[PDB]
Amino acid sequence: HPIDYAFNEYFLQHQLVEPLNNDIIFNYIPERIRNDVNYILNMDRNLPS
């Protein structure tokens, strides 16, 4: 219905869901620490598109 399409529509055009790369995980990390030798970082699980 006009008013219904109205709704559900925007719900689609606002799917607050961004992608995700190993890189982003790495990044949700303080610019520091990574640059603090004392601590070890590494990847193990893969990432599906």
Partner: protein, 48 residues
Amino acid sequence: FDFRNSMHMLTSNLTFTVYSDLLAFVSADTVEPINAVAFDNMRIMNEL
């Protein structure tokens, strides 16, 4: 009620997989305490 004016087409994505918490995928160990270093780099706790 007029049909054609009510019928719409749908742009929907297909098969995600939502992840929460996150982090976890972070494999991380740690040096042995006796080997600490500050921004300094010479070593923290160096009085043997």
